[PDB]
């Protein structure tokens, strides 16, 4: 009975702790990206001769 009472006393903290803090940690990070392009010109010289 004492063990069960201690159980009932602690798991309020268990609920206040574990699921909430784990989901708080989980609610972080995700994939995203950005991109762009150009038609930049690269020139190589050739002598007129």
> Which residues of the shown chain bind another protein in the complex (CB under 8 A)?
16, 19-20, 23
Q: What is the DSSP code (8-state) at residue 27?
A: S
Biggest CA pair distance of the chain:
104
Per CB under 7 A, 3 contacts RNA: no
The least CB distance from residue 1 to RNA, in Å, is 8
25-35 b/e with 16+ CB inside 10 Å = b?
eeeeeeeeeee
The least CB distance from residue 34 to another protein, in Å, is 19
Q: Which residues of the chain form contacts with RNA (CB under 7 A)?
A: 4, 8, 31, 33, 35
């Amino acid at each position: 009975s004492l063990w069960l009472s201690f159980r009932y006393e602690i798991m309020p903290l268990y609920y206040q702790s574990q699921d909430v803090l784990d989901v708080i940690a989980n609610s972080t990070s995700e994939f995203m990206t950005s991109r762009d392009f150009v038609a930049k010109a690269i020139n190589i010289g050739i002598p007129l001769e």
